[PDB]
């Protein structure tokens, strides 16, 4: 009944964000669970690198979200939504060094850049402006990885 | 090992925290989950009424993992982690006016600030510092639960 | 004489950015118009929600024109001006309640969404940069109608 | 002993001010208690709508007993010296909807600008400073019912 | 039905400044227009120099209307709106220099200071709040004025 | 019909905050009263060590209500509220000294921080986020009693 | 050649103006002369309490000497122009008590509140918004003699 | 002469604070001795993680000696006057590594959160306001020696 | 190794890049360059257009790197490899007029706009994302030159 | 009877800085006449180029007299003062372009630069903290001269 | 080893500044003792009037410390240190009137300003940056003692 | 023909400035450079603790070129114009460890803290002023070669 023009292809795409959606949502709670076990002689700098990433990918979400809502569908933001949508196995590290932790994370940035790199290629067609969204989250998201990636490597590693 | 002092009794409230981090974590994607399927002629109101209340539990959820890695053990932050010690049923509403979701919140503090109360006499002899937490906490939560209350009462309502 | 790159294919989104120019210029005069005369138990909600957009699509204005005055043409932003490429009638809503302002709004956004996705595809080709402006406003824009839509629905209303 | 002018032709207007300073104090509390006493489903629309108001006014309070004390008189601020100037029944209507507190709160204001605008014209005379002081306030007081007003209201009401 | 005082001499300030709110949307539309106008080796100076002078007239632009509203009658805010109650032809200056630009400013500002000191005049016996207002305005414009004016003269030019 | 868990306990309470609602409320304004009453030479020093204890204090109260108005009943904050509550005299210092004022506000704050250790201890069992928010605020109200008697002493003064 | 409406009326005004500008000018480095001479057990209280007011006048300079251009006039603002229309004898006052310079600065202030109220009235009739400007100052520049009174007084001293 | 309330239960609270009052000034000169001597290839980080910490501690004494002269006795904060009351040899640690200083200084806290919570329970009876004031700093003691001790762990080191 | 996905094509992308964050680089040390050597009578104008350019194309030197970085390879920025992929001669002019130096300009960013406009068609298939930075990137460019190009010109200069 | 260290020699600085501060203190009105009575198309930039000057040189008054004043003597800031050790004549250019204006103020500068260069010599053996005050001040005095003499060159005009 | 430059002529200077880093660190220690056991009827005057000179001094003595561990050598923080470098008797004054107090700081800073002028010309020739560090420094602590001198002379006291 | 007294003495200086203006601008690039290759698990750290020192430099850079120019000669600050007065090798590493790249950093700052202090000599007599801002400049250069050496060192390495 309610989207910017178009019934479907809308319909399509808002379901395409809210699998991001809700990517987030386990995105920045991983985040932040690691935030608060990572560990060891850096663990005050990675701890804080992550805090931004938290806040922004948050935003992320709202993002989405109030993107969907505009699309017409509504948005479902539940620990149980996200479980339903979800694709990895839930962030299994524990108090752990960094080390392990962002290699844990590279890991799962790694689902989330390949998967909205998709939603993009997906988007290019169906809805412009949600792909726009995506890609800007994207440029943030991989930059992210960047950092936690740079934490272990030398030659090229 | 870690603790602040009591290798046992910290244990036990290390427990305490993580049924609470659990449920704000819960609480704050719910909150974040009204405030965009929220919809009426005050819906903005409401939305926004929310935002604040988010970004606070979100930093309550921070306060007391903080604290249960200070404590000694690791807290567990991941949405696995939170239906591992959620005790409602995950929030139930979906698109839905204001007046809705409100009671349907009013609920969910329910549990909250009857759990958090709970806590902070089971609190009150092992270790106090964390009770003073959830006592900051309950003012703030209990409060947001009369801003939502305050939405549907004249007589009692 | 002056452009970034293509004679014809500027003045070309010269035009276009124009016809923008002045659907924005209305707009937020239509805008400001509905909030100072929005009315009833829901007036403040909406009379600020209205606020952020106002100043946002008034610098939406200023980001067309100085395009516009890069791609080498001269913008125009006298109330003649826009009259001269507005193809609405101007909002005719005088004082009022919030759900007639913004059914009424609603559908001025409507005009506003779609001409500007119709402009988007018309710069595909032509400039991508014009293209990305455009782009950005829309998500902002289309926000703001679901802002406005959100206010009057609940199964798909 | 110490005016800026005039011995005697101050003493008048600084009756005239504490008239007004005990009023603000009168409204001040007033409009808090209406705020932490509104409720239904429009209650932090107003309940915030009041708040710059009260800090609005409370100010508007400083600036004639500051302005008294400048006369020569000493300005009187305890809720003794308030009930003694007051001229109106203290606010009745305890918690309540909106639209009640709001029918209130109108008139309250009612004795306010009616009031204010009475003292301005006793001014024109005396001190003009002075005049200019609640000619600013007068302003911003009467902007303030007509946000009250607006909430009940539809092409008179 | 709603002023704060006088049932007639009120509509008569509220038509009075609704003259005055058509001419502020005029300039603060002018105002923009001429700064991405403007042109030659002095044009981030005067380009800039205007900037505040929008957002100001903007504002007293709000001021206005809200006061309007607040007298009873309601403001009116489009470009209809606009051409109905202007007095001027519309700024004919496109793409030209600062001095030609400041020319036709100049020009414009005069119908603005003419017509407002005209009204505070007219507003003197009418009301007085609303005399303060545009008295205000009043300055602030006239400065506005001299800052063009400023900009060629030599020993009266 | 609502609190947060027990009728009557809050009832209790409830009638507890209200007391102290209405001491700050007097406080205010009396503080506010001898604000602009102070004088002699050491007049700037305290006519602004006050300001913040005002602000504060004013806060210290809404805190009072919006507690009580969460533990379900309703609060009071008109003037003929707080003299029904009052179990002083009203500030009987009118324009005067420092060391008069201070004398005369050391002793006001003796009823305050004397009244709320009273309601903290009758609180230890009732509610203890209730004695959470006035232990707080009594710290600072203490604080700031010494800031007034640190002004007239040397030995034990 | 310009001003904004009287090309007599306003070098008349434009005159009083300059008598001001001068006269602040004058005061604002007898402040600040003063703020660095004053001296005793109160010293930092006064030595501040006068800052602001030093920044605000050097600003009331600015505004008249800006509405002198803005009424046609050439606005003088060296020494040797303030001299020339100054007429007090300069701060005599040396290195000195607070007492002592209070007395003399309250002394100052009463040819700046006489003199200022004198251009008012005279301005009742020449131009109102160079009436309103110097309105505004007195205000403040009362308020500012009242608060160097209060120091030294005790009933009425 | 002067406390709160109680002449003796006051003076021993008043000697449990200074005991406190001078750990902290050790604390935070420890601290800052920490920061400029810590070394190695993780310097910044912790340098930084300090930073906030001493400027929070530093507080932490201002509200102790504050209290301290609340309650009627003087606060002693001259380094004379710390190693009176202190206890520890003096941080002895010097040019050193992050691993050494934070070894270090986990013992140094460790000594500080223990004294903490011992005064928090000889406090639970004595003065409750007190009792706070500590618990507020002790979790914040306690966070910043979790902190400190997350640099050199990872099973449960 | 490490990409966000495509070995070979991202290595592409992170040349275009590196000629990019060269050209800046570049870029904004001649505009710096420009900004102190600029002269005539209208240079602060300029100067102070230029600040924010500099300081907002450095911004774009780290977004660009930190890209390359991000899709693998190494970013190169010392003046050595600046010289290594630049292709214009070196900003040719010295202590000079503004009309000089924004020819000069002109010139400098014709090559950078017409640049990368080029590397963003290159980009259209290859990776989407760096394409997105380098678009936004090129309508603040393109801008800028347009405020530099204003500052000679009238019919079509 | 009070300096830092030697009764003559200070004596002696006072007596240079007191030079100084009447000069600044000309200057600073000097500045701002220059800055309200300057004109022409390049006026805005300068007219404000100026504005961070003479905020920054009346700062330089108050660090001269602090600075006599620390050094035991009174410091003098009253128009009659700076008359008495004024070694100009008084700034003689009334409204003007900026070309003039300029050429008059780098003059004035020519003095300033000149005295302070001397006055800093002077003090490299008599007091270095007074010698550093100047030097601090000597350069963004110069600083600024550059930016009035950089208005009207080229080659080296 | 490190240095700058000069492995001996550094070592002095590091024991220069090591002599000083103590002296601050007593001295910000000794002002907060002073701040909070100040007391009379101009307490919050002074009290204030340090506040800003602890967080300095405080800061004074990182610069130093940090330059230190730049010349070297080790800084030396813990109170144990400073008793070891400290050449005064600790501070003799508890609680006490201001003027006491003064008079005991003056003394006090009067070893600093010249211990710190006499490390100046030792400074001269061996390491001149830091020769300019305690020159700024001594600007700033020599003006604080003017501030407290001022609290008790008139003709020379 | 313009400095701000010696021609001669000045253009020595005025080249002495422009080699360290150039050393900077390496520098700042160098830093940038260094910023975003630098890697491993400490990156975070110093990658920040670098961007303040870029910025800080870039600054320094300004400083120096306006100070040029100030002196008279103009300044030159094209990559061209810096390989021109460069004396190092343009700073070699790539993707590299902090360790490598510190150590590669360490060597780049000694040339130019050596550098700025031969600078700072030759300076004593010519010009002071110029020798004050490289004596401020160094000392931040310094301080920022100690932070980076101390990520490499522990007994004295």
């Given at each position: 009944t309610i989207p910017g023009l178009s019934d479907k292809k809308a319909s399509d795409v808002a379901d395409?964000?809210?699998k991001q959606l809700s990517t987030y949502?386990?995105?920045?709670?991983?985040?932040?669970?690691?935030?608060?076990?990572?560990?060891?002689?850096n663990f005050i700098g990675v701890h804080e690198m992550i805090d931004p990433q938290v806040e922004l990918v948050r935003g992320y979400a709202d993002e989405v979200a109030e993107r969907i809502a505009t699309l017409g569908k509504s948005p479902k933001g539940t620990p149980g939504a996200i479980i339903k949508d979800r694709t990895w196995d839930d962030y299994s590290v524990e108090r752990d060094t960094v080390q392990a932790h962002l290699a844990?994370?590279?890991?799962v940035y790694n689902g989330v850049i390949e998967d909205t790199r998709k939603s993009?290629?997906?988007?290019?067609?169906?809805?412009?402006?949600?792909?726009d969204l995506?890609?800007?989250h994207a440029g943030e998201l991989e930059k992210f990885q960047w950092f936690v990636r740079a934490h272990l490597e030398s030659a090229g590693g």
């Open positions: 395409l964000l809210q949502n386990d995105l920045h709670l991983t985040l932040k669970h690691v935030h608060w076990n990572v560990v060891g002689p844990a994370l590279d890991l993009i290629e997906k988007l290019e067609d169906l809805d412009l402006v949600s792909q995506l890609i800007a």
